Amino acid sequence: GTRVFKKASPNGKLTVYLGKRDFVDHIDLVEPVDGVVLVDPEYLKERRVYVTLTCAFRYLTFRKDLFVANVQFPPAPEDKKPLTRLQERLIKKLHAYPFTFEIPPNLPCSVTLQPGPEDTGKACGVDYEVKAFCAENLEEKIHKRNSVRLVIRKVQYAPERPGPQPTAETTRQKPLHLEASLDKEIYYHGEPISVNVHVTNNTNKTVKKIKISVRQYADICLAQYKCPVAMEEADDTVAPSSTFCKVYTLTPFLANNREKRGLALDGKLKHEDTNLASSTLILGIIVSYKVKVKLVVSSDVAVELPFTLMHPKPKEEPPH
Amino acid sequence: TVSTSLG
Amino acid sequence: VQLVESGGGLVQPGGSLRLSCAASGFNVYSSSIHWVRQAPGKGLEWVASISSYYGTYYADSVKGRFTISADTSKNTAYLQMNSLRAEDTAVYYCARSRQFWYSGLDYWGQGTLVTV
Amino acid sequence: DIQMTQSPSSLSASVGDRVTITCRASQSVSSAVAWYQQKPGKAPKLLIYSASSLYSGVPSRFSGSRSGTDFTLTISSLQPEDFATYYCQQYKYVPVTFGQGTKVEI
């Protein structure tokens, strides 16, 4: 069979059904946020029922909106076309009528910037709230009455099939030649990123220290946020006039990262744990990652590789 | 929020 | 891909143990490691779980006595034991599960016998 | 402590039998249920997850099911290699109580 979400209003006078909480972007398109609402004609003297989709943002504080969309009980006289396969089965199962929202391409994804412990308000980020309501006037000051708020997510995960290798070259001045590369285009949360490091130091001075980091890039446009999610400060030295090779390994995980106020996480529904933000393949938050190889000489040198931190396309179900 | 089945 | 644990043996009650669980083919931070015991002729009892990605859970029937940890650089877990008792006598296992997302315990080690 | 009430404690299931396991929790755990198979003395092994999905490495004869907060692992047809002790397991709440186990013998 299957399972769905069925939040209803505080006074029994309205109910929202959703098939799921997450919607996915195949890059050039976006899934429709599609559901049905049960309506009560016997309460509904106001004579109109409407549903809202809102791509909000939260950041004293600012609450913005990046996208707002609305849809028509009594049934629309002509807009019967976009009824989705999911909705028709609730229609069969139940006085309930569709609501649907095709978020346009080139809009941000479900990103929860951290709820830093020092703050207690609603979490920052691009939260998708679907808000079904009954009203007499679409301009009325919406009270806590028969409306039902429900947060959703719109997300992106692993780009299937093989892709280009994050090979890189950088040299400084004889040459201090630095090369690094990974083994895959895409990589996954919490797994080891295989960091290769070739160095040829024709200078007199020693490479004092080597840092590998994996760094989180999240562009905020309501600016961009930069923070290292992982780091390996190996002691290996490229001795003067030598050829060097080493393979490093790092794993980025949230566990240590919780204290770094302002990181970005995959969209929280309520307060449940999620992975660090899957990369975005535009307003809002656009998030991507790189593996960084740095050499410290007794005076730094570095190379920085395009790293796609993501999650496999989950075939079984969404997170939770 | 609450849950349920399809069909 | 494998799990193998060691450290089972005889101890009189009041003793301690340090079971270990090496594995290959997967890494701890992508996975959650567990211990479970099948006491003589009886069924499985959850004892402890470590969710590597997030920073540890272990049951009331073991609480304050059994403790789970892992050493990451060598892809291994531990199950430190204090104030063991007679009922603790069980053959102990180690287990791994997909952390993202927790889909039940996928692989188990061959089993090690502990008697108190 | 969700009393993850699994039964029967043992079952004779001749080859070809429709082995079926009921399993009632004392509390609602949504769909977060796994199942495992233990061959005498060694590693248990997961058969079903998300209370429905079959794990990679598991013969398709194993099947997850659900109805309310009853969970039920099922084998379409029990082969000679199946016999072991199987365990329901809910994994929404801590403790993650396994069922006391249904042992199967010829």
**What are the sequence ranges of the domains in chain A?**
15-155, 168-310
Instruction: Provide the number of CB pairs (under 8 Å) joining chain A to chain D.
Output: 5
Question: What's the length of chain C?
Answer: 116
Residue C115 DSSP code: B
Cα D13 to chain center, whole Å? 15
Asked if A21 and A153 touch (Cβ cutoff 8 Å), the reply is yes
Q: Cα dihedral angle (A133, A139, A141, A147), rounded to 10 degrees?
A: 0
Residue found under tokens 């770094």: A260
CA distances to A36, A80, D86, D92 from D36, in Å: 38, 47, 5, 16
Beta pairing, strands C31-38 & A49-58? unpaired
Chain C residue closest in CA terms to A312: C100
Structure tokens at D85: 């002790």
Spatial CB neighbours of C69, under 8 Å, sequence gap ≥ 6: C50, C56, C77, C78, C80
Check for a shared fold between A15-155 and A168-310: yes
Asked if A244 and A198 touch (Cβ cutoff 8 Å), the reply is yes
Listed residue (A287, A288, A257, A295) closest to A274, CA to CA = A257
How far does C46 lie from chain D, in Å, by closest CA? 6
Contacts of C57 in chain D (CB under 8 A): 94, 96
Chain C residue closest in CA terms to D101: C43
Asked if B2 and A6 touch (Cβ cutoff 8 Å), the reply is yes
Q: In the CATH scheme, what is the code of domain A15-155?
A: 2.60.40.840
Residue D54: domain span: 4-104
CA distance A39 to A97: 8
Spatial CB neighbours of A96, under 8 Å, sequence gap ≥ 6: A15, A17, A36, A37, A38, A39, A90
How far does A90 lie from chain B, in Å, by closest CA? 7
- Inform me whether the C-beta atom of residue A3 falls under 8 Å from chain B C-beta atoms: yes
SS3 string of chain A? CCEEECCECCCCCCEEEECCCEEECCCCCCCEEEEEEECCCCCCCCCCEEEEEEEEEECCCCEEEEEEEEECCCCCCCCCCCCCHHHHHHHHHCCEEEEEEECCCCCCCCEEECCCCCCCCCCCECCEEEEEEECCCCCCCCCCCCCEEEEEEEECCCCCCCCCCCCEEEEECCCEEEEEECCCCEEECCCCEEEEEEEEECCCCCEEEEEEEEEEEEEEECCEEEEEEEEECCCCCCCCCEEEEEEEEECCCHHHHCCCCCCEEECCCCCCCCCECCCCCCCEEEEEEEEEEEEEECCEEEEEEEEEEECCCCCCCCCC
CA distance C19 to D47: 26
CATH among 2.60.40.640, 3.30.360.10, 3.40.50.300, 3.90.950.20 for A168-310: 2.60.40.640
CA distance C94 to A124: 39
CA distance C99 to C31: 4
Number of structural domains, chain D? 1
Asked if A66 and A55 touch (Cβ cutoff 8 Å), the reply is yes
Q: Do C and B touch (≥3 CB pairs < 8 Å)?
A: no
Annotated binding site of A: 226, 231, 292, 294
Listed residue (D23, D99, D20) closest to D63, CA to CA = D20
Q: ∠ at Cα D86 (C39, D17), nearest 5°? A: 140
Q: Choose among C60, C104, C106: nearest Cβ to D95.
A: C60
- Inform me whether the C-beta atom of residue A192 falls under 8 Å from chain C C-beta atoms: yes
Asked if A234 and A248 touch (Cβ cutoff 8 Å), the reply is yes
Interface test mutation site (partner B, options A2, A16, A18, max chain B beta carbons within 10 A): A2
Asked if the Cβ–Cβ distance from D53 to A316 is below 8 Å, we say yes
Asked if the Cβ–Cβ distance from D50 to A316 is below 8 Å, we say yes
How far does B4 lie from chain A, in Å, by closest CA? 5
Residues of C with CB under 8 A from a CB of D: 3, 36, 38, 42-46, 49, 57, 59-60, 91, 93, 95, 102-111
Asked if D46 and D58 touch (Cβ cutoff 8 Å), the reply is yes
Asked if the Cβ–Cβ distance from A254 to C53 is below 8 Å, we say yes
CA distances to A257, C55, C87, C97, D34 from C49, in Å: 21, 11, 20, 10, 15
Annotated binding site of A for 1D-myo-inositol hexakisphosphate: 226, 231, 292, 294
Listed residue (A52, A105, A148, A114) closest to A267, CA to CA = A114
Residue C83 DSSP code: S
CA distances to A104, D21, D52 from D44, in Å: 48, 17, 19
Contacts of D50 in chain A (CB under 8 A): 316-317
CA distance A260 to A172: 33
Half-sphere exposure of C41 (CA within 13 A, CB side): 0
Instruction: Kindly provide the resolution of this structure in angstroms, with one decimal.
Output: 3.1
Rama region for C98: left / alpha / beta (φ>0; ψ in -120 to 50; rest): beta
Asked if C32 and A253 touch (Cβ cutoff 8 Å), the reply is no
CA distance A11 to A268: 27
Q: Do C and A touch (≥3 CB pairs < 8 Å)?
A: yes
CA distance C21 to A7: 44
Asked if the Cβ–Cβ distance from A190 to C103 is below 8 Å, we say no
CA distance A89 to C37: 45
| Cross-strand bridge partners of residue A61 | none
Spatial CB neighbours of A308, under 8 Å, sequence gap ≥ 6: A159, A185, A186, A187, A279, A288, A289
Chain C residue closest in CA terms to D97: C46
Question: What's the length of chain D?
Answer: 106
Q: Choose among C55, C72, C101: nearest Cβ to A319.
A: C101
CA distances to C86, D3, D37, D49 from D101, in Å: 22, 13, 9, 17
Residue D76 DSSP code: S
Give the CATH number for residue D70: 2.60.40.10
Asked if A299 and A289 touch (Cβ cutoff 8 Å), the reply is no
C86 backbone dihedrals φ, ψ, rounded to 5°: -60, -40
Chains that touch B (3 or more CB pairs under 8 A): A
- Determine the straight-line distance between the first and last CA of chain C, rounded to whole angstroms: 32
Contacts of D5 in chain C (CB under 8 A): none
CA distance A258 to D91: 24
CA distance A27 to A211: 34
Give the homologous superfamily in CATH for domain C2-106. Answer: Immunoglobulins (2.60.40.10)
Residue C53 DSSP code: G
Please name the residues between 124 and 183 in chain A that touch chain B, using a CB distance below 8 Å: 150
- Inform me whether the C-beta atom of residue A271 falls under 8 Å from chain B C-beta atoms: no
Q: Please give the sequence-ordered ranges of beta strands (E in DSSP) within D3-99, or none if there are none.
A: 5-7, 10-12, 22-24, 33-38, 44-49, 53-54, 62-63, 66-67, 70-71, 74-75, 85-90
- Tell me the technique behind this structure: cryo-EM
- Determine the straight-line distance between the first and last CA of chain A, rounded to whole angstroms: 18
How far does A48 lie from chain B, in Å, by closest CA? 25
